Design a protein around this ligand. Structure first.
Ligand SMILES: Nc1nc(=O)c2ncn([C@H]3C[C@H](O)[C@@H](CO)O3)c2[nH]1
Ligand SMILES: Nc1nc(=O)c2ncn([C@H]3C[C@H](O)[C@@H](CO)O3)c2[nH]1
Ligand SMILES: Nc1nc(=O)c2ncn([C@H]3C[C@H](O)[C@@H](CO)O3)c2[nH]1
Ligand SMILES: Nc1nc(=O)c2ncn([C@H]3C[C@H](O)[C@@H](CO)O3)c2[nH]1
Ligand SMILES: Nc1nc(=O)c2ncn([C@H]3C[C@H](O)[C@@H](CO)O3)c2[nH]1
Ligand SMILES: Nc1nc(=O)c2ncn([C@H]3C[C@H](O)[C@@H](CO)O3)c2[nH]1
Ligand SMILES: [Cl-]
Ligand SMILES: [Cl-]
Ligand SMILES: [Cl-]
Ligand SMILES: [Cl-]
Ligand SMILES: [Cl-]
Ligand SMILES: [Cl-]
Lengths: 230, 230, 230, 230, 230, 230
């Protein structure tokens, strides 16, 4: 596969997709037994290991829709990947979204033209896989993790005129990131199961703000919720 | 309120929204104790009653986004309606969607220009309220009802060139109706809780077909799932 | 026909299309001899009768483009309907449009995405049939009815940000309703003759306002103009 | 006025707008008494004269929306022009449109982005002024001229992929030219009265074809209809 | 060819395209030896002559994209024209663009819907031919002519809400005219070489202004730069 | 700066922007004296060094418009970066583009919605800075490097329906990559100088194909052309 230097099935059915290829490293080392490293292309590191005896892979995606699309496609098409879970952060855009909250995206709004190219006249609303999502909600509530379930906004521009999120907050969108629409759509197209699990990086239209401690907690917190989701 | 001839609070916190104002009649009579009739404007009948002692309202919406939008707005704005559940049918567009299946929409794609007017450059992905949705899933599984959870397609045209649903089936969209986007968006805007619960009316790209018996079953079946959702 | 429970040709060549299925009732009873009732589906009542010995039908459409589209299509395709005249009201948006004025739409602007789906890069300007329209103008001037002839605006949302009509008034658009584009386009597509005849319901950017008396007059007034249009 | 080298009111209330600045010459010389020439800028000749004692002006527009827009704006804004009538030809796109037929545009479809720039989410349907149009119909029928009344298509490209007109013929659009939308819209914006009167230049999806004789007849024929329209 | 009354090859490989058909006259008479006149249709004059012994043609285009498109297409398709250079003016929109400056467009932004019709989801960025452009830059610097090289804006409307150029100046667009996008695109499509060379007509968001003397200089100045470009 | 862990001015006026953060490493080590490493965030390595005594920086961008936008913005806004040159590859889409050819983008088409968000009704054609571009052409021709100068296509999707490039080849677009539009636009907005320099990675609509040797040559070849461009 053009972008991923890996042997067939040297990659798990299940892949966690952080934006950062260095958090990809971190997650493997700090959470998985028997750490393999299949990919080193573009520094976009890929890893495979076990957790509670089960095989789990970890691939960094880079940032923005066009980048994650690249990896999700190859992972799916060239490695028959079955379950793809994003684990990154997002900028909180409501006030009723707390820094501790862990976010499960049912859907996402986007300004990426990825869908309009393919569909034209249709606002295409992408979709988390319920089984994956329910499992994550269950895995959250049993351990008693703070968890919100709603939509996010997959943006093309980190720095924007940003008129959008101010309007999107008014419709109950929870936060902004740059990957989810791309995951959900490509996963749905190819018959796979996708879900996006996200922590708060900071409040964009500040209601409150974040410390290094709060992130370290919610980060770890999110990885668990993901891992136990199967 | 312009379209609904009703006294303040003569309407419940919770309203079931069938497309048909005559199924609206049916549902009241056949499911609710102490049947009031608040609205008779445009034959778009509105009813209030109790079920398991609790107050439940039933308002017909008519067809298409512009029509349901009318009722949802007034119900919300003029009657502080808290929970709005659609109960209609949809044309099944996948083959793995069975005539018995009861459908819970997490989201919907639309070709209505309702959102693009307000948002512009954004594909806005509307969102069912999770609490309502989870409750419906729970109320489904305990009685053991067949139930699928994914997206639908809110269309503007019953008869189309329909090139869309053939493409939308390829992305795992479950079925086509004409209301949901409009519900989810207006509910989200005004801080209310919405959910759309749907039976199969027939298979549009026929995988299988429907009898009068199968509908009568799933219809009733869906009303229960709704009713026990609280 | 899916939505209209009627026997072949039990429906006239000519159909008046009020939004309200109860004004549909009213019009039949109060204007036509030998009243038949072909449709009772969805409470969207359909009627056939005579006037000056000639067969005339009356079908309610519901509200919004997607709804009227449904009836117009079936009426045309399943009942070879030849002449379709809308008789509803509209919100006056200029000041030089008087509450008494009866409106004949040559065309309509819309924000519905119905046309952009089919045409893409084209602003499609729909068209009243001239013969029908001229006949209505003649039938207006002989009795001496106040009558204006220009465009309207077929909206998707009764409640809007409404920035549009303020801009559209500046271009001489007369009023806003929710049906006409849909009529004109479907009528033109299938080789039929359509026309939309409208009274003022109120002034939206208030220049003046309406009583119950003024409506009763213009309503009746409009039905005549329609009826004598053949 | 930047584009028209003319003294205030040296231009009539009424202006005929042929595309060709040389037919502009022709029309003056061959139809009007006391021929003045106000404009010679860009060879886009402008003329003023009398007909049946009444003052009539004649200004060439050039081709395409952006060009006629230029003249229509200045004529309106800088010379308080009251009535603006286009007199050009169009490519017939239906078969039931005959080479002899004289065309009165109620409206026009366009692919020009002129309107979408100003309106955004609105398909804006431009509008002939009825008074002007009725007068032209009357002036046609009394002399007994063949005359059709419907819509046209204002295109941006003489040579196209042209997929549009094949689809637009299916909706009863009569013919294609390159000016009308631009006239109707600018006329409506500034409170003026516009109308577009058109002959057939040839059949684009050939049903029949044209001689030099047939044009000379219909051309002259159209100028009359225009002239007597007041 | 429909719009150009000319015999095969009575037109040069190289054609200068001023907007004004009278500057077309001027340029021929004042710059070329052995002046032929091939076209007189629509007053849109076409000329052929020699300069430094070499054959050079001069065709007026009229104004706006739809008009120049007409001539560029026929010139290319019916006369195998190889090199097409626009020589007109543009409204300067930055302040760092001086009245003396001669402008070489690498590209242009447009609001014309010409490209979106053909491409859909693509912002198509048109392209000057480098060879032509470099040659013009060389021919500029050797004589020592003030010359800027960047983008312009091909507008559909001389009079606009004009919100665009205020935003476009902020991105370094140099000036606004009404032809270039149309040239570059049609030239690129048919394998020909195009370039647009432009003087300042005035400053639109005034930084400074123009005399008749400054234009006469830069005009002549621009024709040279064009002519020596081969 | 959020994404780049660097001290003020520890970054040069001039930055080379390869997609790959590992080619970023390579370029530094193999071309620059006194190698500093300012950034290690996300493995997206940043380096500063000298070449012919002059300070030159090297920052990886990742893939797709949203990603490079991130770095270009911070580099510009937080480090007053003056000159930004992309050095990556592109998929050749014409046949007359040779594997050896080095490509200088004057402009790029895109399907990214980055511009349409900001501009709306405008196809915005981005622009290489001429000074940078000319300098690169000069630095190419003196050493005698094969070099083509035209447009490219900045895509959002590596894997597409790809109907676009087949149409875009027909208009003389040279190749497809995923960064340039984003560079040119952000550079132009902030008053900086940008240029994109690209090798062929392979032929997408295969005319010919590539070896490892041909890339190693053209790669090195391109870095020179960049480096000597100042
Ligand atoms: N736009 C945006 N705003 C935020 O506040 C935010 N917080 C996290 N992210 C995610 C998404 C990207 O992968 C990447 C960009 O830093 O991280 C954000 N994106
Ligand atoms: N488009 C469409 N296709 C179907 O097969 C279908 N089945 C049910 N519905 C819903 C939605 C409307 O409220 C209304 C239109 O009949 O019923 C459908 N809509
Ligand atoms: N938008 C809108 N504004 C008005 O003031 C108005 N007056 C009448 N109508 C028509 C059209 C609908 O069928 C229906 C909505 O009430 O009635 C209106 N629609
Ligand atoms: N597109 C197009 N097709 C035709 O068959 C046709 N016939 C006449 N016209 C009008 C409109 C222009 O002003 C001008 C272009 O020749 O003439 C036409 N335009
Ligand atoms: N829009 C616009 N603004 C100007 O300041 C300007 N200056 C010159 N031009 C060019 C382009 C047309 O061919 C024609 C319109 O007058 O001349 C301009 N166009
Ligand atoms: N779409 C696309 N097709 C190609 O053949 C191609 N060749 C190189 N590139 C550039 C651009 C990306 O940064 C990145 C994606 O691999 O590399 C390409 N992109
Ligand atoms: Cl992330
Ligand atoms: Cl329904
Ligand atoms: Cl109505
Ligand atoms: Cl014409
Ligand atoms: Cl010009
Ligand atoms: Cl690259």
């Amino acid at each position: 596969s053009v972008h991923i230097g890996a042997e067939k099935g040297q990659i798990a059915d299940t892949v966690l997709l952080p934006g950062d290829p260095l958090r990809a490293k971190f997650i493997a080392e700090t959470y998985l037994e028997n750490v393999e490293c299949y990919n080193e292309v573009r520094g976009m590191y890929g890893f495979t290991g076990t957790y509670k005896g089960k095989k789990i892979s970890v691939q960094g995606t880079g940032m923005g829709v066009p980048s994650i699309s690249i990896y999700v496609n190859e992972l799916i098409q060239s490695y028959d990947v079955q379950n793809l879970i994003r684990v990154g952060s997002c900028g909180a855009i409501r006030k009723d979204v707390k820094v501790r909250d862990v976010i499960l995206a049912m859907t996402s709004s986007t300004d990426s033209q990825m869908n309009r190219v393919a569909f034209g006249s249709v606002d295409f609303a992408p979709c988390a896989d319920f089984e994956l999502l329910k499992n994550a909600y269950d895995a959250a509530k049993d351990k008693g993790v703070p968890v919100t379930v709603g939509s996010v906004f997959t943006a093309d521009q980190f720095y924007n005129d940003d008129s959008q999120i101010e309007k999107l907050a008014k419709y109950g969108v929870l936060g902004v990131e740059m990957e989810t629409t791309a995951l959900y759509t490509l996963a749905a197209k190819h018959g796979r199961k996708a879900l996006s699990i996200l922590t708060v990086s900071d409040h964009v239209l500040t209601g409150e703000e974040t410390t290094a401690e709060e992130r370290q907690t919610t980060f770890h917190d999110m990885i668990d919720v993901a891992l136990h989701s199967v």
